[PDB]
Design a protein around this ligand. Structure first.
Ligand SMILES: Nc1nc2c(ncn2[C@@H]2O[C@H](COP(=O)(O)OP(=O)(O)OP(=O)(O)O)[C@@H](O)[C@H]2O)c(=O)[nH]1
Ligand SMILES: Nc1nc2c(ncn2[C@@H]2O[C@H](COP(=O)(O)OP(=O)(O)OP(=O)(O)O)[C@@H](O)[C@H]2O)c(=O)[nH]1
Ligand SMILES: Nc1nc2c(ncn2[C@@H]2O[C@H](COP(=O)(O)OP(=O)(O)O)[C@@H](O)[C@H]2O)c(=O)[nH]1
Ligand SMILES: Nc1nc2c(ncn2[C@@H]2O[C@H](COP(=O)(O)OP(=O)(O)O)[C@@H](O)[C@H]2O)c(=O)[nH]1
Ligand SMILES: Nc1nc2c(ncn2[C@@H]2O[C@H](COP(=O)(O)OP(=O)(O)O)[C@@H](O)[C@H]2O)c(=O)[nH]1
Ligand SMILES: Nc1nc2c(ncn2[C@@H]2O[C@H](COP(=O)(O)OP(=O)(O)O)[C@@H](O)[C@H]2O)c(=O)[nH]1
Lengths: 220, 282, 283, 270, 288, 219
């Protein structure tokens, strides 16, 4: 059927490779794997002065889009937000602002396992007020959206592990102090992300085709 | 909790390896029991009392005295023969020059570009001896206290305190006190520190100065227990009971109650007062 | 006749002690909570905003009483560090703070009419580096600042938010951390490796650097010993537990055993090097 | 029985009817117990409350003062002159402080010489300083330079009796050591002391005036210092050999060698 | 006062004077044969034989002899100077000149040894005459002119105790009359003979004033005759024995009580203080 | 008639012996002409003291030429001295050419028997040595021989009256005893008095025939 591509960007160590391998159950780098083309950017954030970097990623999608005009375009851009902060880092906000009109983004909270109940609520509220303050127009999910936008940017945990729990092979990170669980739908919310990715793949593709391409076709 | 209270333990442990340095000077006429009192004060056989002779230059002695894990590098400054000579005018110049040379050495060592841990050499306390005349201070003693008290810590001691009936010790001690007040010789300072307990301790210590002190090196026993003192055909002049003598209070103040305090006054007052006189002259 | 420690500590108690800590790391790494849980007293450090354009230094001074000891504690938190786009000149303000403290001390010591012992020691004695828990290796900024700062202040690498990392990945991160440190030739502040008989005690800790710390102010009720812990919906993480996190190692080293060691290394080792450089450049 | 044997009886009568004169000079460092020893030697208040001893009163220059006493005892009338040098060695510089002592002693000698050589002689009032007690501080080391130089400059003008002064402030072992060192320091400096006719020089002296019940002693917080004991102090030795054994041998030697040696030098000069 | 001491001063004088040795000089003046050698063999109980004079001596001279005597523990050197030839010549206007010359010569010896620069007055031996014994002839009529002249010419130079020689020849009524006549001639001529001391309350009132019996009527000899149970000294006559130690016969006891018993040191002290001082003052005024 | 003069010093008592001799300056008290010569020698100088007696005896013989002559020249030589003074020897040598010299020792009660023997021998030796021609006097034989041996005589005198041992006599009282002037064993008073009494006439004739007659030969 469709041949969905994928942009995954973020600072090093934010669990990008782990999450992409866990989500699709399969292991600038444009790797071709329904044909997936996971476009994972290796060098972004760890550099001494990461000022230009948001241009080459902008450069590549423009090259990808113009080549198609001349379906391998990048349709979704999973951007990762570090759990450490009380809000959004300048690099994160700048990348979202300068990348949201080329590829359609999905804000996602990296490593949700850092935050408690009131803390995850507070951080999510802060992200909501900040995106509504900088006027950040993320991809709006088609209309139960209340507990999505309560959770958006989806708190996520990614782990290529089958930790044993209750005699079941659960996707979970260990530690030395109680295991965490991926499928548990209380506030891990990876279930929400996978479910609605699967159930609005077509909508994602259509909005990418009819809005971002059309805007580019007006740009070119 | 929180452990801010264990910092004194760390100070204690760091103080062990370095070692404390003390530099004590003893000043008085020859034969006045200086070396002997030093020997009895530190409970150590440092005996130059059998060195019946005159001297030439300032005598300084380096020793290491260790007890309870604490090591004292001790520089004892016994003055040369002074006061014994016929011409005693300006006999304190050797002592003053020694003090200034020690201060200058330490300050110059501090001022250099390259610095190790500064090897202190300043004299910290000075014990002056009063001849037990029973009438009043000699003019030499008054002059040398006047010329000395502004440069290092001075403590006056009544040598041969066993020569006086208690009434005469009473009269002599308050005669000396009146002379001290009238010449305005401020002895080891205790001006007006705002702390209460320590201030009353030090004001009750001032009221006893000068100290009736006897030195010796004997171990005589008295019927019932072993004591420390001297023998006369009529009794044992005792060093360790307050009724018979006042050595205990002098040793307490000098060593076990104010010795670190003496060092602080030396560095923070006497060195600093010299330093402003010296450095401003530079 | 050698009971001088008693009178020494008596004058010290009549005076009280002083200490200075610097907290350097990226914002959101958990410095304020860890410093509240290190002294167990709620310093009012409000929720900030990342929009700080450059590295700034916020200093808070407190008087802490325990038993008979009064301690003047000066915490200095670096805010805005490691967030902006231009991360090249981020290591200058910390350098300038340390050098300014040393300059003040040098000017006061070289003053003609000194102020006796009244030198309020503003020299930053301890410096805690907070390293992001990424599982791969040092950032370029981290290595740059750590190398540029290890020769001015006593630097202690500490992994922030250790609860994120698992034990295997924590140890892997430790091994590439020390590999990068030795490769780039940085002399991370070592506790005395050959200290007579305490040599083993202060060399094992040197081998255990960098630490991994967890902090919490929420007093939670586990057993009849209500503790300092963070209660995630999947489990409770203890701040003061040797099995979980190495916060107690940091507290032991920084508070109970090695305060005066840090002060002495600040005075004898670093400040005198600063003195030599300044006097050589003085003329 | 021509009866010559009653000649000593006639000497007795004339001597006991004419009275005797004695002159004792006390020189030393102040505070050494000089007035107390003087009072305890004659068992009288020569230095009373109204007229105390030198240090209790007088030190101005370093000159010398004198006091007279008449002692009538068992019919023997003794005119005692006590000469004190109040303030000697108690100055910062003690160079040539022996000038006052020498001038006084030769003043008495010159007065006697003038009295004798005059054509019309009356009875000769013998005011010459017969005895001179020099006090040495009980330091225990040796002669102070002032002391040795005083004795060297006084041995050929008067009979000097060195005294150890304060003697209960000084142990018998250190007492003997100081005596021996005093002998040596006299020997190598060529000092000719008064050879006592009859090793004990210098003597040790201790005295007291407060009677304790009933002996003259000093009540120390540890005991009683009693003078009369032979072992304790030689105060008995000084008392006996000065006021009961050689009160007049001293006069004989002063008139016999210290006088003509002064006369031969003066008359040859004239 | 407070307690004792200082009573041994006279004892120390006594011991030093005894050790130094005593010296007494006696000038014996009297006509030859009056008993001078005999009386002073009597007085000192020993034999001072000195040859019984040539009565034809061409000139009046002096024979001075020195002896040593010892009693108990006191040692005394006597310089007995006898006038030999006195009163024998036809011409007696120069009889007393040698005696006065001898006295002044001894005074000058003393005074000349005194003024020497390297003098030794402590050890030097004085040769001045301390007591002079004059012998009065037992005439019964008074004193002859020569006796008056000699006593007057010699009264201020040495102490004179008038003595009646061979007193055993006058009866007691005659003796009293002759004694009273002697003292009358003594006072009238104003001869300053040696009088007893007055000051000392012990003896110098009672014995002094009681002995207003001068001059002494004494006799002397060398033979000891048995009276009662004692070998008492006496002068023998065919009609009996004249004893000398009995008061009622002669006054020898009182003469000895002066010379050797009670007032010898007074004699020496007066020689040094009354006579020597006079000569010394006169000479030092003469010489300048 | 008889001229008894006594010659010598002054104060030897010769007046008392003169008054005692006969039991009763000159005195004619037989017509005994006593001449108590003033005792010479009382003056300091005795050069001229001898002269007064020579012209008296020289004038005496002159009236005789123109019996007052001194038949006996009683000479009293002092008992005190050892012998003859120069004065006595000169007087005896100058007088014996004219007047009959007889020596007698005055105050014999002041002298012991061995001494008077000694002084007699010395007096005779001094007479013989100086060629003095003293009178040698010529029962009568026995008294002549004794008087020759007894030259010179020793005689005591006494004027006052004493109750000695009984009978009232002339003598002297002393605490040692009584001097009996009369008693021959005490002194030669009796010898002298008897010699003068018995040889008065021989003295007169010898004076006329020897001393006066050779004076005529000298004259
Ligand atoms: N996952 C995890 N979170 C923590 C840990 N410690 C603290 N936090 C949370 O992380 C947030 C960061 O805390 P701070 O120390 O205040 O952040 P900061 O960077 O110091 O900035 P300030 O708020 O100004 O102090 C806090 O809200 C804590 O609740 C930890 O050990 N692990
Ligand atoms: N009756 C009597 N005879 C005496 C007395 N004294 C001396 N004689 C005698 O006189 C004799 C002469 O001796 P002296 O008179 O003593 O001799 P001198 O006169 O002293 O002469 P010199 O020997 O030179 O002194 C003696 O032998 C005695 O016998 C006396 O007192 N009475
Ligand atoms: N706690 C936690 N750890 C994670 C997560 N994702 C990755 N990690 C850890 O990060 C390490 C490597 O992460 P990695 O996939 O290379 O980071 P990325 O490539 O930047 O996405 C692994 O050892 C994981 O244990 C997460 O969601 N939560
Ligand atoms: N009575 C008395 N004697 C003392 C005392 N101290 C020392 N001595 C003796 O006095 C002498 C003093 O000698 P020393 O101390 O060497 O004199 P210095 O060193 O020249 O001052 C020594 O022989 C001591 O034995 C004391 O307190 N009292
Ligand atoms: N130890 C001692 N003290 C004495 C002696 N004699 C006197 N003293 C004390 O010394 C004090 C002063 O002596 P005094 O004037 O009074 O001394 P001075 O000035 O030398 O005549 C007196 O109060 C006595 O108690 C002695 O022989 N030995
Ligand atoms: N012993 C003694 N006394 C005599 C003698 N003759 C006289 N007298 C005494 O001498 C005293 C005076 O003598 P006097 O006859 O006047 O002496 P004249 O004048 O020289 O003869 C008298 O008192 C007599 O007692 C004598 O022969 N012997």
């Amino acid at each position: 059927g469709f041949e969905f591509t994928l942009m995954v960007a973020g600072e090093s160590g934010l669990g990008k490779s782990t999450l992409v391998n866990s989500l699709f159950l399969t292991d600038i780098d444009a790797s071709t794997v329904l044909r997936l083309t996971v476009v994972d950017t290796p060098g972004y954030g760890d550099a001494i002065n990461c000022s230009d970097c948001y241009k080459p990623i902008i450069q590549y999608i423009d090259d990808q889009f113009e080549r198609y005009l001349h379906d391998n375009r990048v349709h979704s851009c999973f951007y990762f937000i570090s759990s450490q902060g009380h809000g959004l880092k300048p690099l994160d906000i700048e990348f979202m602002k300068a990348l949201h009109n080329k590829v359609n983004i999905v804000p996602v909270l990296s490593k949700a396992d850092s935050l408690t109940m009131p803390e995850v609520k507070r951080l999510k509220r802060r992200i909501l007020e900040e995106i509504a303050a900088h006027e950040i127009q993320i991809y709006q999910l088609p209309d139960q959206t209340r507990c999505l936008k309560e959770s958006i940017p989806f708190a996520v945990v990614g782990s290529t592990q089958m930790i044993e729990v209750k005699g079941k092979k659960v996707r979970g990170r260990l530690y030395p102090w109680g295991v965490v669980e991926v499928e548990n739908p209380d506030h891990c919310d990876f279930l929400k992300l996978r479910t609605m990715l699967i159930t609005h793949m077509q909508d994602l593709q259509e909005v990418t085709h009819d809005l971002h391409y059309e805007n580019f076709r007006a740009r070119r | 909790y929180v452990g801010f209270a264990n910092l004194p333990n760390q100070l204690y442990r760091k103080s062990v390896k370095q070692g404390f340095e003390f530099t004590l000077m003893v000043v008085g006429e020859s034969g006045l029991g200086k070396s002997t009192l030093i020997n009895s004060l530190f409970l150590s056989d440092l005996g130059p009392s059998l060195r019946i002779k005159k001297t030439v230059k300032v005598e300084t002695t380096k020793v290491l005295i260790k007890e309870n894990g604490v090591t004292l590098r001790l520089t004892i400054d016994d003055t040369p023969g002074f006061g014994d000579a016929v011409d005693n005018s300006n006999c304190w110049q050797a002592v003053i020059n020694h003090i200034e040379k020690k201060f200058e050495d330490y300050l110059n060592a501090e001022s250099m570009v390259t610095r190790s841990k500064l090897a202190d050499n300043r004299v910290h306390c000075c014990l002056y001896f009063i001849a037990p005349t029973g009438h009043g201070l000699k003019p030499l003693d008054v002059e040398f206290m006047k010329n000395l008290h502004d440069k290092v810590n001075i403590i006056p001691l009544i040598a041969k305190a066993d020569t006086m009936t208690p009434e005469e010790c009473l009269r002599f001690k308050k005669q000396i006190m009146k002379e001290i007040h009238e010449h305005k010789i401020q002895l080891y300072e205790f001006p007006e520190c705002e702390d209460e307990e320590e201030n009353r301790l030090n004001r009750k210590l001032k009221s006893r100065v000068p100290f009736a002190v006897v030195g010796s090196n004997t171990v005589l026993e008295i019927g019932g227990r072993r004591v420390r003192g001297r023998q006369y055909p009529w009794g044992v002049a005792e060093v360790e009971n307050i009724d018979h003598c006042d050595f205990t209070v002098l040793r307490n103040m000098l060593v076990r109650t104010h010795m670190q305090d003496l060092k602080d006054v030396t560095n923070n007052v006497h060195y600093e007062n010299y330093r402003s006189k010296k450095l401003s002259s530079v | 006749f050698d009971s001088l420690p008693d009178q020494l500590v008596n004058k010290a108690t009549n005076q009280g002690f002083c200490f200075n800590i610097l907290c350097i790391g990226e914002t959101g790494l958990g410095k304020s909570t860890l410093m509240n849980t290190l002294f167990n007293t709620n310093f009012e450090n409000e929720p900030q905003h990342h929009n700080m354009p450059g590295v700034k230094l916020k200093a808070n001074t407190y008087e802490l009483q325990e038993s008979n000891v009064r301690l003047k504690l000066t915490i200095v938190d670096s805010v805005g560090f490691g967030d902006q786009i231009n991360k090249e000149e981020s290591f200058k303000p910390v350098v300038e703070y340390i050098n300014q403290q040393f300059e003040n001390y040098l000017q006061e010591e070289l003053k003609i009419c000194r102020s006796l012992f009244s030198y309020h020691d503003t020299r930053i004695h301890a410096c805690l580096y907070f390293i992001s828990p990424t599982g791969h290796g040092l950032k370029s900024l981290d290595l740059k600042t750590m190398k540029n700062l290890d020769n001015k202040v006593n630097i202690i690498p500490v992994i922030a938010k250790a609860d994120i990392v698992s034990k295997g990945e924590l140890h892997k991160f430790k091994i590439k951390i020390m590999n990068e440190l030795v490769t780039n030739g940085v002399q991370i502040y070592q506790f005395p490796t050959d200290d007579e008989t305490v040599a083993e005690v202060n060399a094992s800790m040197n081998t255990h650097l960098p630490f991994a710390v967890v902090g919490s102010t929420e007093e939670i009720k586990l057993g009849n010993k209500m503790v300092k812990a963070r209660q995630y919906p999947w489990g409770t993480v203890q701040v003061e537990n040797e099995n979980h996190c190495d916060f107690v190692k940091l507290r032991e080293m920084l508070v109970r055993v090695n305060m005066e060691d840090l002060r002495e290394k600040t005075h004898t080792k670093h400040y005198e090097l600063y003195r030599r450089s300044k006097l050589t450049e003085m003329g």
